[PDB]
Amino acid sequence: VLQDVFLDWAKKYGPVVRVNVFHKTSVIVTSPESVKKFLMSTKYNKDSKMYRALQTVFGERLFGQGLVSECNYERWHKQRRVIDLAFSRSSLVSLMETFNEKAEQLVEILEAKADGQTPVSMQDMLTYTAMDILAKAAFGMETSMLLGAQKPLSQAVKLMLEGITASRNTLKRKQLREVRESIRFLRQVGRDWVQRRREALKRGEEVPADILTQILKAEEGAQDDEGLLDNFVTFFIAGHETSANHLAFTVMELSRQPEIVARLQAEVDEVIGSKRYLDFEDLGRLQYLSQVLKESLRLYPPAWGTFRLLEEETLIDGVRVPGNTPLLFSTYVMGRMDTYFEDPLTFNPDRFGPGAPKPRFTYFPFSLGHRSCIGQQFAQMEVKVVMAKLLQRLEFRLVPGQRFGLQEQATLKPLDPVLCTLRPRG
Ligand code: HEM
Numbered sequence: 527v528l529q530d531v532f533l534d535w536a537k538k539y540g541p542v543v544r545v546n547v548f549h550k551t552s553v554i555v556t557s558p559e560s561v562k563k564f565l566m567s568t569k570y571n572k573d574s575k576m577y578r579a580l581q582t583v584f585g586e587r588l589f590g591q592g593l594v595s596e597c598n599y600e601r602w603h604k605q606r607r608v609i610d611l612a613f614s615r616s617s618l619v620s621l622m623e624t625f626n627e628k629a630e631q632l633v634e635i636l637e638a639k640a641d642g643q644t645p646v647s648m649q650d651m652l653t654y655t656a657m658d659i660l661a662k663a664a665f666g667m668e669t670s671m672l673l674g675a676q677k678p679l680s681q682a683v684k685l686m687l688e689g690i691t692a693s694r695n696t697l698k699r700k701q702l703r704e705v706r707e708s709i710r711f712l713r714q715v716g717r718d719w720v721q722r723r724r725e726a727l728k729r730g731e732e733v734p735a736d737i738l739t740q741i742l743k744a745e746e747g748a749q750d751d752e753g754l755l756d757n758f759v760t761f762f763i764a765g766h767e768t769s770a771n772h773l774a775f776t777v778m779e780l781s782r783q784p785e786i787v788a789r790l791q792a793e794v795d796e797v798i799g800s801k802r803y804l805d806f807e808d809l810g811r812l813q814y815l816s817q818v819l820k821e822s823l824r825l826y827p828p829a830w831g832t833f834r835l836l837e838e839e840t841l842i843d844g845v846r847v848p849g850n851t852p853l854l855f856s857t858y859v860m861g862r863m864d865t866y867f868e869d870p871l872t873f874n875p876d877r878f879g880p881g882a883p884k885p886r887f888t889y890f891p892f893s894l895g896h897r898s899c900i901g902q903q904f905a906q907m908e909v910k911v912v913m914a915k916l917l918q919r920l921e922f923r924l925v926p927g928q929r930f931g932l933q934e935q936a937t938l939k940p941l942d943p944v945l946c947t948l949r950p951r952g
């Protein structure tokens with residue numbers, strides 16, 4: 527992938543290197559001290575130019591000015607102020623139900639295929655699980671992709687994601703219209719779930735706190751609904767894709783880590799035993815699993831980095847960088863430099879063991895500072911629940927011909943689906 531070229535240039539030409547990314551010039555900055563300086567201060571904001579591709583795709587508005595793609599500070603802070611309420615500790619705890627139900631359903635489906643002969647794309651299975659979780663937790667709606675439903679919506683998402691791949695890269699005639707079809711499809715599903723929400727509150731019906739309630743609340747006194755559909759599509763996608771890929775990477779890696787798996791099984795037996803559903807307080811004690819996930823994100827971060835606009839010419843690590851320059855920061859790159867991580871190609875979860883110094887601005891799969899992931903705790907919870915349940919009940923072997931490796935898409939994800947054969951534990 528393109529991130530592997532940047533790593534080579536980082537290693538070779540040091541901490542400040544001009545590059546071309548999405549066919550625009552920027553400076554990739556790879557010192558911890560630089561990361562800290564620019565990420566940990568609100569003085570630095572995202573670069574409209576770099577995110578302008580995510581805002582609109584092929585003349586069809588995708589994330590628009592939603593929580594990811596909005597770069598002006600004050601406009602972003604206004605939404606983030608209110609959307610933040612849907613991610614409080616009590617908000618989160620109440621989602622353990624959605625996470626558990628979906629996790630259980632996933633494990634059950636796979637148990638039905640656990641003959642040890644039936645190939646299953648774990649990438650697909652984990653995408654359906656993540657979307658099912660997101661759709662319900664965020665919007666109070668059931669997609670049931672895990673049981674074959676909403677196969678059109680699943681297809682819209684797929685095409686739209688290739689869309690972003692070609693929009694900001696790729697330098698036939700039908701494939702470009704299907705992407706536009708897909709983007710408008712997602713916006714219309716948005717309208718319906720927004721409408722089906724308004725109708726239920728027009729019947730004065732009781733509806734618990736949501737991401738949906740919060741996005742609506744942020745869009746009050748808006749002449750259009752566009753700022754609301756922006757945030758619908760942003761969360762619909764951001765709230766499932768990176769989690770899906772993170773899961774896929776982890777199961778991929780694990781299929782060739784028998785010792786790690788054993789310890790994982792060993793751990794999950796002690797904390798939950800055979801209990802069907804996990805309580806909020808259970809996740810905290812899945813400490814080794816926590817470590818595996820953290821290491822998974824170090825080698826395989828779905829969201830490989832972020833951009834900040836450097837407005838005034840500044841001196842960065844002894845290099846003069848000119849004003850109006852986009853800064854690229856890459857957790858993928860830093861995670862693979864032996865300057866910051868001994869023997870960096872080795873998947874070693876002990877790196878995050880208790881007592882190890884926490885990596886110091888050399889590792890940020892959820893980014894850092896104010897533009898960090900609003901969904902961090904959300905995804906860390908959901909990912910422990912799925913992984914806990916998989917480890918509890920099933921074993922996965924990777925089908926011969928399945929490659930370990932990456933593709934760059936809208937996010938980093940396994941090049942291959944994660945085709946596996948499955949057995950019951952024991
Ligand atoms: C393991 C999965 C996850 C990863 C690795 C992750 C990663 C990221 C990172 C690196 C940023 C990009 C910041 C940038 O562009 O500079 C981000 C943004 C964000 N993520 Fe995620 N994330 C994941 C899951 C989620 C989920 C579950 C949600 C939604 C429920 C979410 C929604 C968002 C939002 C809306 C933002 C923008 C926050 C803001 O600018 O105010 N994340 N996350």
Ligand SMILES: COCCCC/C(=N\OCCN)c1ccc(C(F)(F)F)cc1
Nearest residue numbers: 763764765768829830831832833936937
């Ligand atoms: C369709 O892509 C989903 C949202 C953008 C992916 C992303 N991070 O967001 C994760 C939300 N949970 C992202 C990936 C790469 C870049 C970069 F600018 F580095 F290319 C920026 C954002």
